[PDB]
């Protein structure tokens, strides 16, 4: 891991940007010649191979976080996968040559990035990165931070362990498919339920849960059955809070949560993808990736406009960037 030649990282980029707030449809252009961001001394600078959108990229692109955003111009996207090309004089963790993967913004509503996932080129925190597990590819790989890291931490704030169930609302999704996964093989839930419509049961079976409700047919909270550990990914604390056993535990990403539930917004960092590289290399924790990925990087809008659907199922990802 010698440093690169410094004439062999461009300064400028092709990216994705936006100027002013608003839908992804109308605000979200590509610029052939975006200027790659200057790393500090904490910091890499990454060739980017693979990206993922999130839905906090177009809710941060309409302008729901202003009060607490960057500067726009923006280029979007958080979860990256690549290789680093650059590193800062204070980091430790990786050299030249590393393949590496996370969600770039430690605090997702506060400071994000100026200089996003969707470029050629980002510079990432030590801090938020690891390394990439070598059986995955780097779409694989890329799917996996925000969403991955979201599920852990909510499943650690509802306090799960072994033995316990638990219920989760909006199974298919980008981070639904994960807090299934983590329940079962990390925390060893025995029990594990989750809502989502008639022609997505099976996928949650496939994934570790024990019980696939269609929430087209049955209302969850109307069951008998009551849970210890209730986490919402859909935004519906109301019904939540009714499918929770006494003294058990509801948290929600959507808010706003009415107690007893909480609303978080998690933490990226590095270091909770090194703790889940052992179940990412066995294959007891699977990246799910949504029939339509990859998305070339000439098709961004539409992977935006596919996932402003509601409809995704596990990851939509960009690549070849
Ligand atoms: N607070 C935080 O830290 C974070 C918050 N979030 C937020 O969490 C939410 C989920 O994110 P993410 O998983 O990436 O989103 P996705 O867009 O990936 O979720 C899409 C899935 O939602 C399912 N879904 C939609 N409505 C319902 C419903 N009523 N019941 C059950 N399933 C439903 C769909 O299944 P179907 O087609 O069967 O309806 C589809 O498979 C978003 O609002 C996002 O902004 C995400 C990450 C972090
Ligand atoms: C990461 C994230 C989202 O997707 C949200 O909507 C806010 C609560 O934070």
């Given at each position: 891991?010698?440093?690169?030649?410094?004439?062999?990282?461009?300064?400028?980029?092709?990216?994705?940007?936006?100027?002013?707030?608003?839908?992804?449809?109308?605000?979200?252009?590509?610029?052939?010649?975006?200027?790659?961001?200057?790393?500090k001394?904490?910091?890499?600078?990454?060739?980017?191979?693979?990206?993922?959108?999130?839905?906090?990229?177009?809710?941060?692109?309409?302008?729901?976080?202003?009060?607490?955003?960057?500067?726009?111009?923006?280029?979007?996207?958080?979860?990256?996968?690549?290789?680093?090309?650059?590193?800062?004089?204070?980091?430790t963790?990786?050299?030249?040559?590393?393949?590496?993967?996370?969600?770039?913004?430690?605090?997702?509503?506060?400071?994000?990035?100026?200089?996003?996932?969707l470029?050629?080129?980002?510079?990432?925190?030590?801090?938020?990165?690891?390394?990439?597990?070598?059986?995955?590819?780097f779409?694989?790989?890329?799917?996996?931070?925000?969403?991955?890291?979201?599920?852990?931490?909510?499943?650690?704030?509802?306090?799960?362990?072994?033995?316990?169930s638990?219920?989760?609302?909006?199974?298919?999704?980008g981070?639904?498919?994960?807090?299934?996964?983590?329940?079962?093989?990390?925390?060893?839930?025995?029990?594990?339920?989750?809502?989502?419509?008639?022609?997505?049961?099976?996928?949650?079976?496939?994934?570790?849960?024990?019980?696939?409700?269609?929430?087209?047919?049955?209302?969850?909270?109307?069951?008998?059955?009551?849970?210890?550990?209730?986490?919402?990914?859909?935004?519906?604390?109301?019904?939540?809070?009714?499918?929770?056993?006494?003294?058990?535990?509801?948290?929600?990403?959507?808010?706003?949560?009415?107690?007893?539930?909480?609303?978080?917004?998690?933490?990226?960092?590095?270091?909770?993808?090194?703790?889940?590289?052992?179940?990412?290399?066995?294959?007891?924790?699977?990246?799910?990736?949504?029939?339509?990925?990859?998305?070339?990087?000439?098709?961004?809008?539409?992977?935006?406009?596919?996932?402003?659907?509601?409809?995704?199922?596990?990851?939509?990802?960009?690549?070849?960037?």
């Open positions: 891991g010698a440093a690169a030649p410094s004439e062999s990282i461009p300064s400028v980029n092709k990216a994705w940007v936006y100027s002013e707030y608003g839908k992804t449809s109308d605000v979200l252009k590509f610029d052939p010649s975006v200027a790659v961001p200057e790393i001394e904490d910091q890499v600078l990454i060739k980017v191979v693979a990206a993922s959108l999130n839905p906090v990229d177009f809710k941060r692109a309409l302008g729901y976080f202003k009060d607490t955003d960057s500067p726009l111009p923006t280029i979007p996207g958080y979860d990256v996968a690549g290789v680093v090309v650059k590193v800062g004089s204070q980091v963790k990786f050299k030249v040559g590393d393949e590496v993967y996370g969600d770039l913004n430690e605090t997702a509503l506060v400071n994000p990035t100026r200089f996003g996932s470029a050629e080129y980002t510079a990432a925190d030590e801090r938020v990165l690891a390394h990439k597990p070598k059986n995955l590819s779409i694989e790989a890329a799917s996996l931070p925000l969403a991955i890291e979201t599920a852990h931490e909510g499943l650690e704030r509802a306090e799960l362990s072994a033995g316990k638990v219920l989760v609302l909006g199974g298919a999704g981070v639904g498919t994960h807090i299934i996964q983590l329940a079962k093989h990390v925390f060893g839930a025995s029990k594990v339920a989750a809502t989502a419509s008639t022609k997505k049961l099976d996928l949650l079976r496939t994934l570790g849960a024990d019980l696939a409700i269609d929430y087209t047919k049955e209302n969850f909270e109307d069951l008998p059955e009551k849970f210890d550990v209730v986490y919402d990914a859909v935004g519906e604390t109301d019904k939540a809070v009714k499918a929770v056993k006494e003294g058990g535990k509801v948290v929600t990403i959507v808010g706003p949560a009415t107690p007893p539930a909480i609303l978080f917004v998690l933490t990226s960092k590095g270091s909770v993808l090194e703790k889940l590289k052992p179940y990412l290399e066995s294959g007891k924790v699977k990246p799910v990736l949504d029939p339509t990925s990859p998305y070339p990087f000439t098709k961004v809008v539409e992977a935006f406009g596919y996932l402003e659907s509601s409809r995704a199922t596990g990851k939509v990802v960009v690549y070849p960037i």
